[PDB]
From a paper:
Carbonic anhydrase (EC 4.2.1.1) is a zinc-dependent metalloenzyme that forms carbonic acid from CO2, a byproduct of carbohydrate and fat catabolism. An endogenous carbonic anhydrase frequently contaminates recombinant proteins from E. coli expression systems. Here, the serendipitous discovery of two novel crystal forms and one new, high-resolution structure of carbonic anhydrase 2 (CA2) from Escherichia coli that arose during a crystallization campaign for an un­related target is reported. The presumed Zn2+ ion is coordinated with tetrahedral geometry by Cys42, Asp44, His98 and Cys101.
Here, we report a case of persistent CA2 contamination that crystallized in three forms. Two are new crystal forms and the third yielded a high-resolution (1.43 Å) structure of a common CA2 crystal form. We report two novel crystal forms of E. coli CA2 that was obtained as a purification contaminant. These lattice parameters can be added to the list of crystal forms of CA2, saving time in the case of contamination. Sometimes, as was the case for the data sets resulting from CA2 crystal forms 4 and 5, there is no match for the cell and symmetry in the PDB. The fortuitous discovery of a CA2 crystal in the previously characterized form 2 from the same protein sample revealed the contaminant. Additionally, we report two additional CA2 structures in new crystal forms, which may save time when others encounter the same problem.
Numbering used by the authors:
A (entry chain A), C (entry chain A): 2 to 214
B (entry chain B), D (entry chain B): 2 to 215
């Protein structure tokens, strides 16, 4: 599969649809605003649509290395502000994946270049949860960190001006922390679901509590 | 559809893979590195893997409002630098889409909040090609702006220190600018494809010249 | 002058003041909020205070390479938002300097590393004003670009959500574009002063008009 | 004082230099590169050149709300990378100040607008040392937080790829963490000074340990 394949793939996939499944494009035209914002990793190991069965246009997507929400990344903050205040999504899903290359790179810490600064936000989680991660056998620490990262970015998202204002003014927005494995593509809920400032703190605090012994 | 629906859709998707297509999670077990970086818009009207037929794990992907490549957005630059220097993708594709609401709102300029600052980069492109855009019928402008955007993001991408270093050190990295519409999902090459500094400039200049045509 | 000098410098400069000029620190305690926001270059060839005679605490300062306001730099945008909405400054001054190393680096374009991406925002001005800059003798193009850069960042600052909202709601905020030379430290007004959206566009458009022949 | 005042102050400053101190603009004509990068807070209660007595042209300077060094702020990273790789400064100084309104508002947490997102990085430091901060009298906390901030920004700076690369390739670059108050302008070494990876970690750890003392 080279570039020349992608275009002819597309040209025959579009031609089969207009000939055979015309409602696909008509579904897109009558597609309403998305109700889901998906924040995922650039690895995109399984695409979000196939993972959840969402139709085209039903979800708004952001992706960056290791699905981060940095307090001061305007790229991601601008996706969220537009999602919550303009489109008025009802669910934000943050989704990590076990075996993510960014997360593993943050632990091994090779000299990769510019990307290492982005990843410093994960080394910080790794060191924040040092004792929690220590208590566990070596072979589970990478997937645990993948989970901790997702929980921390849920925590970060809820603490931003976008979500703070939305919840203060009563807008119904729910944040979910998810992860899936490569063996089964089975979504796993990290159980840190937040619907307001109150549940944000309790569920986060409980989420960290369950990983500890 | 609510959240429990997605969970049950996911469960029923997982099983119809492990029984019908077991060589799927195997194909993903083997960490085979993506050959393509797709920079698209968060709108994701038609998912990239559907538009192209690429298997999961064959594309590295970044998505923001209106598929921008801003010279000093560390988020997208981190994605690009990781794709080029670590994964060593051979092709980067910036894909816009006609009818893009980020491009619409840049022009209409409602008071949306934080996002209007992101959108000023698009309004910059609007004003830059004001003349070109005026020589056209009004109904054709928004879509020309969607094409101008992609073409300027390709220009910006080629100018990043990442792309400059890779091209100077001999790494084959080709950059493409595409767009599609909702009526057929047909990909449209904007013809600003670049493989080194010289083609970056000549194809960009050629791309702005061909919109003068009609 | 090494590090050890700076500390003992400070320890005797503070000691002379408390002994001899105590009103300096008492002026600081009763110092009200600043009325000026200064956005300048990291070169800081002449410090802003000596350039204008402002007392300590009278100005709020941001500095970055080549005094830029990028549409989406949250570092600078956050300084401005805090300056305009919290401190309620009355004047924002953007100040470039002839002979700035960032501006010159953007034209010569050496392979400097990470910084070159920041500077791409100036190469863009250089190419935006290609014909205007061409019409002039080679030896004036660098200082002209220094001036164009300042005007463009005034233009950018006025177009941000911070200033747009402030002017819509009637807040009196004035943006100034300044530059000084190294031969005399004489401030030069670029005459693109904006007090609302209307003057923003007229003065910017006139500022570019005066550089052309 | 309004704008015309600054213009006339500037004019009367220029002349009292060219007549009384002509070897000032000469000293600046010679492009002698700064040996110091000062990362301070936009509050600039006492200008850095006054605090230290450094001549103009001897310091490269960056200033933001609460003198932050965020891992992914390209603005400050650009300043640092230019100072270390091009100017080759030998010392970097991050200087906080007691009474800093950015630190105050991080704790008090009013609904200020866009700036609260910048300030979340400080609230992160507050929560991190919650225990340390609680073993102290309340009136001493805000100032301890001002010191904790500087110490964490030094930690962050030392971890940037810029500082990692320079230390690994042998470039003498020393990083310092300082603070001062308004009552005397006396500089206070926070003692987290670092010259390589090993001292970065040990001085940081030692710095958080010594605030447990009293
Ligand atoms: Zn990943
Ligand atoms: Zn779009
Ligand atoms: Zn400069
Ligand atoms: Zn401060």
């Amino acid at each position: 599969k080279d570039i020349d394949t992608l275009i002819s793939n597309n040209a025959l996939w579009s031609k089969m649809l207009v000939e055979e499944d015309p409602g696909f494009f008509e579904k897109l035209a009558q597609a309403q605003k998305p109700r889901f914002l998906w924040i995922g990793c650039s690895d995109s190991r399984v695409p979000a649509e196939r993972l959840t069965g969402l139709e085209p246009g039903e979800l708004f997507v952001h992706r960056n290395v290791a699905n981060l929400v940095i307090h001061t990344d305007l790229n991601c903050l601008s996706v969220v502000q537009y999602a919550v205040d303009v489109l008025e999504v009802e669910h934000i899903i943050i989704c990590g994946h076990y075996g993510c290359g960014g997360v593993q790179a943050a632990v091994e810490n090779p000299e990769l270049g510019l990307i290492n600064n982005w990843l410093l936000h994960i080394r910080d989680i790794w060191f924040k949860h040092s004792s929690l991660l220590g208590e566990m056998p070596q072979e589970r620490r990478l997937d645990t960190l993948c989970e901790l990262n997702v929980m921390e970015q849920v925590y970060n998202l809820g603490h931003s001006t976008i979500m703070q204002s939305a919840w203060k003014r009563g807008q119904k927005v729910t944040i979910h922390g998810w992860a899936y494995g490569i063996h089964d593509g089975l979504l796993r809920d990290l159980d840190v679901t937040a619907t307001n400032r109150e549940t944000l703190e309790q569920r986060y605090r409980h989420g960290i509590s369950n990983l500890k012994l």
